[PDB]
Design a protein around this ligand. Structure first.
Ligand SMILES: Cc1ccc(Nc2cc(C)nc3nncn23)c(C)c1
Ligand SMILES: [Zn+2]
Length: 316
């Protein structure tokens, strides 16, 4: 029929290791590679153009070499991961990432305010990621090119662009891919009936607590039901970590300058709302995507507070 015409392109799963391919310009990328993406755009149903020659396309890990490369870079073997990452990237590459008070933020789009406050929070706590994909993308994000980092957060969290997201859950996912091995927490629970029992927590469980926003109150003791039915007290015995994260269902809470690192504010309900970020510097700054305001005091519906730590031992 038609004289065969070809171009050379490269396929990849990590945008570093390239794989030479010769493609037939009369067949779609999908017929030759399976699902195929060009900087996030789905080109599966597109036939090669001359302008494509020499360009790099993402594909799914469909042979053993690509499977190993994908696991080594992303630390996942979820079959749909790369598709979800590319689908997110096609949107996040169009977002804007302004510098707000020296931090990379995200201009509002696509219901992304939970991602903005997560990204702002990471830049204020000591954290190293384990997957090279997150290491590389986070470095770019700090420099101001955060599109790949934001698309990876979405893919790791199984959230699509626009989907309702929770900051505490997002942070927990990101912490699972970070090196928290040297973090340790010891708690004690005291019941006037049953007595007392210590517990040691490690890793992500050592830096996250759900039930109170106040780190000081956590050191003093919080009231929880004992398994016997009577009210008991749980308090922090020992902490070794560079930060802690305290979370609670949103409630009116007063943030005092100098007593915390940063916080997440949620205005809304369980199906509808909006996040803002508060950071304690020379004064209290409220970052709302690209928007910035200041105040000497702050009271709002807070749901997460971050604090600095290094080593703490109770006197109780
Ligand atoms: C001897 C004894 C046995 C059971 C309990 N009850 C308990 C222990 C722990 C570790 N966490 C708890 N959360 N709710 C209750 N908890 C206590 C305080 C002492
Ligand atoms: Zn008890």
């Amino acid at each position: 029929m038609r004289e065969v015409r070809t171009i050379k392109v490269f396929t990849t799963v990590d945008n570093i290791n390239l794989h030479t391919q010769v493609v037939d310009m009369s067949m779609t990328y999908g017929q030759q590679f399976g699902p195929t993406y060009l900087d996030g755009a789905d080109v599966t149903k597109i036939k090669p153009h001359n302008s494509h020659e020499g360009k790099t396309f993402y594909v799914l890990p469909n042979d053993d070499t690509l499977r190993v490369e994908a696991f080594e870079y992303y630390h996942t073997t979820d079959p749909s991961f790369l598709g979800r990452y590319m689908s997110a990237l096609n949107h996040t590459k169009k977002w804007k990432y302004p510098q707000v008070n020296g931090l990379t933020s995200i201009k509002w789009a696509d219901n992304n305010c939970y991602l903005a406050t997560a990204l702002l929070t990471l830049q204020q706590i000591e954290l190293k990621f384990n997957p090279p994909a997150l290491q590389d993308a986070y470095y770019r994000a700090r420099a101001g090119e955060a599109a790949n980092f934001c698309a990876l957060i979405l893919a790791y969290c199984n959230k699509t662009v626009g989907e309702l997201g929770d900051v505490r859950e997002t942070m927990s996912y990101l912490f699972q891919h970070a090196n928290l091995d040297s973090c340790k927490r010891v708690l004690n629970v005291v019941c006037k009936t049953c007595g007392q029992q210590q517990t040691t927590l490690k890793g992500v469980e050592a830096v996250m607590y759900m039930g109170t926003l106040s780190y000081e109150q956590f050191k003093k003791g919080v009231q929880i039901p004992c398994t016997c039915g009577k009210q008991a007290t749980k308090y922090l015995v020992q902490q070794e970590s560079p930060f802690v994260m305290m979370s609670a269902p949103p409630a009116q809470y007063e943030l005092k300058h100098g007593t915390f690192t940063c916080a997440s504010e949620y205005t809304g309900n369980y199906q509808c709302g909006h996040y803002k970020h508060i950071t304690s510097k020379e004064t209290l700054y409220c970052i709302d995507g690209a928007l910035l305001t200041k105040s000497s005091e702050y009271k709002g519906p807070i749901t997460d507070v971050f604090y600095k730590e290094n080593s703490y031992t109770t006197t109780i």
